[PDB]
Amino acid sequence: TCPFYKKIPGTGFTVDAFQYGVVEGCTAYFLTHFHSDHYAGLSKHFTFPVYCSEITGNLLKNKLHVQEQYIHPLPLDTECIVNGVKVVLLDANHCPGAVMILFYLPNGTVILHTGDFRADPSMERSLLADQKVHMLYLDTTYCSPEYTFPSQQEVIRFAINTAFEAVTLNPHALVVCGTYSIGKEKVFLAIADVLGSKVGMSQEKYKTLQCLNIPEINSLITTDMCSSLVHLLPMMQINFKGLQSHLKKCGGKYNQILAFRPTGWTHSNKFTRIADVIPQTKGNISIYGIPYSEHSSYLEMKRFVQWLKPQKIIPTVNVGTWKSRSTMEKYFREWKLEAGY
Ligand code: NI
């Protein structure tokens, strides 16, 4: 049944709750972003109001064929009324179209639902600075102190420098980048920009990217693989067998593959710096795992929460085991005693 951490008290609303059938008492279903564990259940047969960003609404119409009459896109950073309740959508710094949602309950309670997010100090100057938040529904994906990772900027500088050096040393090398969802577009777009190429990809992935309102996108991507020297493949294909196979397909145009797997966290992060990352190599194929995250590190999460000073935290991730729930509750209490709220 629908878990309590997907329901907004004092309203008829749910958040990211499309896989439970008709949730009794729900008058409006919000969707924070277009990732499959969150939209699971939606299709052209859905007949209740969906509230989302404009980009998420484009993906629902074009990829899932949800009918237009049930898609209710909202602008960001704008007070809107939904079924009698004031709401605001804020940029979550996750994937394209991802939002956090502020609910202003009739009784005076204010609720923030982060959806999935990567906390940032810029959020401390949004509409969140303007009133107190009582309850926080928090993306706790990486809520443990082992989870450190570099800035997105540091990771893209490493990728651009590695790719540019490899292709200038060997003009017959191909660059491949893995993907299985929206998000992390800066990785393949920044590498193609430094090389003077478009990114080549499948018709399905090209359609997805054309839903994202990314400026000048027609200048950056293509379905013509032959003209491109940065290719996107399914993340599953980013291994030695899948890559050797791909290289056969290119008909002797290339003699070397340099591949990137933008993972979340990997336990080389506890030891190794970004400067010190090395690939796995077999023959003329090399694979780099790069720690490009679209979720908060531990420290980023902690700063946001100590700034916000909520009265109550409701975790939305890692909630399925008693040891994970107890560990997170211990960190929340540490943060509150340290900061004095
Ligand atoms: Ni997500």
CA-nearest of 279, 182, 162 to 235 is: 182
In three-state secondary structure terms, 101 is strand
Amino acid at 320: G
231, 174 contact by CB (below 8 A)? yes
**How far is residue 159's CA from residue 281's CA, in Å, rounded to a whole number?**
17
Containing 177, the helix (H) or strand (E) segment is strand 173-179
Q: Which amino acid is at 200?
A: G
Residue 101: partners with Cβ closer than 8 Å, 6 or more residues away: 15, 30, 32, 87, 88, 89, 90, 112, 113, 115
Residue 201, classified by CB atoms within 10 Å of its CB into exposed (0-12), middle (13-18) or buried (19+), is buried
Cβ atoms of 106 and 83 within 8 Å: the answer is no
Phi, psi of 311 (to 5 degrees): -75, -30
Q: Tell which residue, 110, 84, 111, 105, has the closest CA to residue 5.
A: 111
Rounded to whole angstroms, the Cα distance separating 165 from 288 reads 14
The partner residues of 173 in beta bridges, in order of sequence, read 256
Q: Which residues surround ligand 1, an ion (CB under 5 A)?
A: 35, 116
How many helices and strands, by DSSP H and E, does the chain display? 8, 18
CA distance 157 to 187: 10
Cα pseudo-dihedral 54, 56, 58, 60, rounded to 10: -140
DSSP H or E run through 67: none
Question: What is the experimental method?
Answer: X-ray
Question: Distance of CA 312 to CAs 14, 309, 315, Å?
Answer: 18, 9, 10
What is the Å distance from ligand 1's center to 163 Cα? Answer: 27
Q: How remote is the CA of residue 35 from the centroid of ligand 1, in Å?
A: 5
d(CA 290, CA 263): 6
Phi-psi category of residue 17: left, alpha or beta, with phi > 0 → left and psi -120 to 50 → alpha: beta
Sorted by where each starts, the structural domains of the chain and their CATH numbers stand as: 1-147+296-341 (3.60.15.10), 148-295 (3.40.50.12650)
Could you tell me the distance, in angstroms and rounded to a whole number, from the CA of residue 257 to the centre of ligand 1? 29
CA of 51 to the centre of ligand 1 (A): 17
For residue 256, the surrounding DSSP H or E stretch is strand 256-263
Looking at residue 259, the DSSP 8-state letter turns out to be E
